[PDB]
Amino acid sequence: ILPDSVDWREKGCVTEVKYQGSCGASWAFSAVGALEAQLKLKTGKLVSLSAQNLVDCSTEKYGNKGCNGGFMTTAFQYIIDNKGIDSDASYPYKAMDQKCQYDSKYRAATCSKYTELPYGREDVLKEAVANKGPVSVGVDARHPSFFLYRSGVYYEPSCTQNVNHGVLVVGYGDLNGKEYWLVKNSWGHNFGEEGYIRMARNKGNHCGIASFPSYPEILQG
Template sequence: MHLNRSLCIFATLLICTWASTFFDQEWSMWKTKYNKKYTSTREEAVRRKIWEDTWHRVQEHNKLADSGLSKYWMAVNHFADIAPEELRKRSCLLSNGATTDEPATPRHFYGLRGGLPEHVDWRESKCVTEAKNQGLCGSCWAFATVGVVESRLCLQNNKLMTLSEQQLVDCDNVDEACCGGLPVYALKYATNHGLMKSEDYEYEQKQKACSFNEDKAVTLNLTKYYSLPDEESIVSALALEGPVAVSFGVDADFYSYSHGIFDGDCAESANHAIIAVGYGSEKDENDEEQPYWIIKNSWGEEWGEKGFAKVPLGVDKCEFSKYAASFDFLQ
């Protein structure tokens, strides 16, 4: 009996030692991969504890996904050392519940039987720039706006340019720089001023004095910018015209998204701007079609599927359509 107890204690110590060594190695590799540095030993200890909690949460969730109880998988990415309560406080739209006086433009929903393709992915046109990273600045509204303009310009003239989010952060006085904004407001600014290329006005993750140079601005020839009222309108606008700026109520788990169709929790209201670049559907474990949006985020290529993700279509997931915005070109 004493021998069995001793063996049990030894095995427990062995497992604990292995676990400690494993996490030491994983933590070191993760810090190197994402270039993480901390100001003190105390801060690193706090962040490591959060990272370990995230690691366990990701493993538990992925077990559910592997067994068919969730439609998406998670990863221990560059947000893993940020606590869920910290992530939930992040917002890069204007104050929750903000409204816009820009009119919603109803669009006839043609439906798949009425002429729209069953699958659209504007990345296939080579007119979608790679996913960028807004960093610590709450400038998702600028990235969503610029990303839509980049793609739509390319679809019009077959030339993909990388335009400046920093110009909007610094110079758009209606929006609130790193404290949030709305794409429909930013489209108004872009209509009036044009946008410089990112190489001429580089992104710096903070607001600076406006350095707009009209001589280096790309004239956009936008005639009308507007809100879109619902998902049906977004489907039509996206299929017929190109990517659309949309919103999303991001809760903590979305930060850990890896792949699949995100069916996790949402924030109470939209707090983030992203870009709808396509839509499609795939069969689930019950052989039923699950329609989805393809979205482009502004959290870098380390997040999701090289910065892109799939979210459910047809249920206005996480207030997807609440702040949707698009524009028309001069014909």
Template sequence: LHSPQARCNPSMIDPRCQFWCPPHACQTNHTPVAHISRYAHTKVGDEDDLLRAVSIGPVAVAIDASQPDFMSYTGGVYSNAACMSDKAGLDHAVLAVGWGSSAAGVPYWIVKNSWGTTWGMDGYFHLQRNASNMCGIATDASMPLV
């Protein structure tokens, strides 16, 4: 995606931003690589079930990304007690791709955001794991079965 406006921030909704792809800029290959037979969901709120799914491959998850400190995240393990974990409070789709623990021993999820590489840690963030379903990460998680 390209932006003709130098000050355009793709992570914020701004009517001045118009994203476009120049004609014929993207090369496509129409050969199927895989066939998605159906989708599976993890158990609602079950981080252990999500961990099993992420150990197989990336999992699409919905989270509460409405907290101002999340929008300005630059690194570390994100945790905010004000985050919602019920389905009605989830407002953003991201991709859970792994897990780990900080140097201080805090377990976290490795999550890919869609706000570009200038946000977070090159477009990724660490969300506290095993913390009562922080920001609803295990509330609405699904993955394709190929």
């Protein structure tokens, strides 16, 4: 059996909530967020990775469009191909498209591989979050209720399983039997519960949270 509840923040594996601003870079924050946790597990150091590095450098070859959107999976592939990603401190976020300024001097992580989970499987998603770490996912965030969410287990009747906003599942649990995913957003600390949103779990792939999950790994060799 899996634990009833997990919260990778309690294991020191989750950096501060970031603020994407007017740049549609949530895919980039989702990607680095998943990698930050694998890095902490392997090295003992928690260090924000450079979302801007991805925006500026993980571009056309990876099907990504900088501030106009992208994919976590090909973000990971870029880090594999590039043999590194800079720290956020060395390559901080500017919420706009820029020229690629990747520098191997300031590499703070690598990526060995990534794994994609099957569409809609919230049981498989739960197992990965428990056994692997935070999982990059897309959600359907095209709803005023999403922007307006303040607290509780978010359930939107009109939500769809088509995803358009990258976020990071850092855990799961229940509140009085209402099951939820613990989701790290990139809209700063003032959104939701200190930048997090708890989203309805085991409710028919609500908002497409398990439509396109994936997580990276950093192996010993």
